[PDB]
From Swiss-Prot:
UniProtKB keywords: Dioxygenase, Iron, Metal-binding, Oxidoreductase
KO phenotype (gene knockout): Impairs the production of tropolones but leads to the accumulation of talaroenamine.
Entry binding sites for Fe cation: H205, D207, H264
Pfam families to which the protein is assigned, alphabetical: 2OG-FeII_Oxy (PF03171), DIOX_N (PF14226)
InterPro entries: DIOX_N (IPR026992), IPNS-like_FE2OG_OXY (IPR044861), IPNS-like_sf (IPR027443), Iron_ascorbate_oxido_reductase (IPR050231), Oxoglu/Fe-dep_dioxygenase_dom (IPR005123)
EC number from the UniProt entry: 1.14.-.-
Native organism taxonomy: Eukaryota, Fungi, Dikarya, Ascomycota, Pezizomycotina
Protein known as: 2-oxoglutarate-dependent dioxygenase tropC
Cofactor: Fe(2+)
Length: 291
């Protein structure tokens, strides 16, 4: 068992044959129904954009810890959960140790005086005073835009797989793109030579939202996915020019389980590891209804 790779070039091309485009819908619906994950290529985002966001991520986490804590998540407006979260505080199971993960959290930018500001994960972002807009904020928000565009493509492909499966309009799912809740996290995993097997980078979880898009770093590993049929954890290989796509619980319930939300985690390694995780959640008003 291996996590598959799906090339969406045809679906984004305006000259590809309808056969080529359907083949993309087949490979996607199928990976999401069997593994809940795939690797995605053919997205059209340049290698520069991926280089630039890891530049931002390293600059940020290289900051002094007192410097990051100045925008610690507990300082964000109300229930906007934005800013810096340090390592060794997130836990998953009582027998185990907290996660080595260090993370920085953004969402869609909303002025402080907006009506929804302060509500759950909606409001303004917190930005580090010690970095210039040009070093950090502008690239981060530009990458967010590229991610929003890609996840909108992914959603419409999923909707088309729903059409083929159960006969619904191929825009069943497109209402989550209306004013979406789209957090992203910049992730840092400090390396360890001899790690305790009771501690992970991130422990066994599912994602709660709809779609997640992950950018891993060339030369690292750690991400693995639980596949019930063989009762095994499958590794997710770092593919060149790829994003890792998985389904969340909201998509699970909202389909019949047809798109699976699969358990996954990141074990600790000796190599320093960065990743950028962007997620698409259900809306703040949208009552998500099954089939
Ligand atoms: Fe996750
Ligand atoms: Y205003």
């Amino acid at each position: 068992e291996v996590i598959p790779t799906v090339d969406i070039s045809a679906w984004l091309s305006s000259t590809a044959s309808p056969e080529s485009k359907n083949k993309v819908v087949e490979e996607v619906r199928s990976a999401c129904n069997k593994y809940g994950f795939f690797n995605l290529v053919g997205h059209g985002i340049p290698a520069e954009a991926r280089e630039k966001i890891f530049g931002c991520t390293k600059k940020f986490f290289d900051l002094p810890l007192e410097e990051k804590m100045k925008i610690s998540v507990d300082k964000s407006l109300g229930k906007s959960f934005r800013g810096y979260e340090p390592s060794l505080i997130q836990t998953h199971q009582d027998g185990l140790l907290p996660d080595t993960k260090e993370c920085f959290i953004t969402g869609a930018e909303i002025p402080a005086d907006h009506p929804d500001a302060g509500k759950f994960s909606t409001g303004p972002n917190l930005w580090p005073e010690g970095l210039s807009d040009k070093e950090f904020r502008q690239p981060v928000m530009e990458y967010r835009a590229l991610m929003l565009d890609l996840v909108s493509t992914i959603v419409r492909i999923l909707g088309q797989g729903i059409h083929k499966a159960f006969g619904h309009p191929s825009d069943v799912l497109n209402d989550i793109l209306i004013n979406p809740s789209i957090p992203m996290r910049l992730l840092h995993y400090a390396p360890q030579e001899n790690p305790d097997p009771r501690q992970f980078g991130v422990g066994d979880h599912t994602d709660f939202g709809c779609v997640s898009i992950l950018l891993q770093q060339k030369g690292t590993k750690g991400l693995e996915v639980w596949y019930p049929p063989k009762e095994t954890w499958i590794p997710v290989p770092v593919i060149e020019d790829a994003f890792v796509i998985n389904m969340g619980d909201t998509m699970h319930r909202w389909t019949g389980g047809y798109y699976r939300s699969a358990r996954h985690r990141v074990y600790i390694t000796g190599e320093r590891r960065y990743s950028v995780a962007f997620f698409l959640n259900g809306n703040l008003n949208l009552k998500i209804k099954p089939l």
